[PDB]
């Protein structure tokens, strides 16, 4: 079971003997009456794209996924590769199903490949990376910085180039270093 | 230095004065071993062929990177600025292509050369820009920026505010 209050990008669940994913959604909480959340939905299985509000204490059943380890080896252009760890078949995905879940992802790490009747909609990295700093502005309040993958983030002014941090994947930010 | 028996894709070494960057390879044992290349002269842009004895060394490649104040364009040149010297140097478009995109009058940019060819332009990783000009579902608006960039901001967004931008990706970081 999981409320409409409670979605995330990528989310999926159980509505009219269908399985759809949050793509986006914003929870409006107004001033005056009921919040409700307005939402940008994926069915999975036919692949349409609907618009729904729910009750943010509405709560629909969690969809029965499929999480394969594979290891994603890399990406070129709008393209993603995959290889199963068991089969050594290699599977391309396409930008629509990864959208940002890769940028703090090294080439070659084990992530989540996710799917439901045999159909692969999206990914799943780990929760957490450790990535080095690349390039920043030397400091000792946040500035910008690039790290190994190429991806940019804000971080601490006294993290430097040559650094070791952990970032969450799912909001994209600094947690700590080392 | 680099032995031609371990050239790979994306090497790039000097030779004949020139710079090349290793776009295709093939190592050959028939007589006498040979390396196979298709070249990118990294200069002129000029793309050719070339064999090689795998035991022939070559001096990698260094790019020189100056610092220089980019000033202005006028028309179709581009004017850049020694900030000790204060000597210009004025470039083509040819030169330039997209690395101005996120960059404003007076701010600091590194200028690629190799023995006195200058090849190109790179601007800082990150940039502060002013906003110039500026749904159900979704929490971005289009804008534009000073420079004529656009680029996909929060709703709180207003024209005068000045916005951090990722150049490599053309994306918004933060305001201020």
Same mark, same amino acid.
Do not use: C
């Given at each position: 079971?999981?409320?409409? &209050? %409670?979605? !995330?990008? &990528?989310?999926?669940?159980?509505? *009219?003997? =269908?399985?759809? =994913?949050?793509?986006?959604?914003?929870?409006?909480?107004?001033? /005056? #009456?009921?919040?409700?959340?307005?939402?940008?939905?994926?069915?999975?299985?036919? #692949?349409?794209?609907?618009?729904?509000?729910?009750?943010?204490? *509405? /709560? +629909?059943?969690?969809?029965?996924?499929?999480? /394969? %380890? +594979? =290891?994603?080896?890399?990406? *070129? &252009?709008?393209?993603?590769?995959? +290889?199963?760890?068991?089969?050594?078949? =290699?599977?391309?995905?396409?930008? *629509? @199903?990864?959208?940002?879940?890769? /940028?703090?992802? @090294?080439?070659?790490?084990?992530?989540?490949?996710?799917?439901?009747?045999?159909?692969?909609?999206? $990914?799943?990295?780990?929760?957490?990376?450790?990535?080095?700093?690349? %390039?920043?502005?030397?400091?000792?309040?946040?500035?910008?910085?690039?790290?190994?993958?190429?991806?940019?983030?804000?971080?601490?002014?006294?993290?430097? !180039?040559?650094?070791? $941090?952990?970032? %969450?994947?799912?909001?994209?930010?600094? +947690?700590?270093?080392?």
């Amino acid at each position: 079971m999981i409320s409409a &209050g %409670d979605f !995330k990008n &990528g989310v999926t669940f159980e509505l *009219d003997g =269908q399985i759809f =994913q949050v793509i986006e959604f914003q929870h409006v909480k107004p001033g /005056k #009456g009921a919040a409700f959340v307005r939402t940008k939905l994926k069915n999975i299985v036919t #692949g349409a794209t609907i618009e729904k509000t729910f009750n943010p204490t *509405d /709560k +629909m059943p969690k969809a029965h996924i499929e999480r /394969k %380890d +594979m =290891q994603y080896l890399y990406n *070129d &252009g709008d393209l993603y590769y995959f +290889m199963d760890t068991e089969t050594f078949e =290699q599977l391309p995905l396409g930008k *629509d @199903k990864i959208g940002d879940a890769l /940028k703090f992802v @090294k080439e070659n790490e084990i992530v989540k490949v996710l799917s439901h009747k045999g159909n692969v909609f999206g $990914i799943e990295p780990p929760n957490f990376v450790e990535l080095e700093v690349t %390039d920043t502005e030397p400091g000792f309040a946040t500035k910008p910085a690039i790290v190994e993958t190429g991806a940019s983030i804000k971080v601490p002014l006294f993290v430097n !180039k040559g650094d070791i $941090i952990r970032i %969450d994947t799912r909001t994209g930010e600094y +947690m700590e270093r080392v």
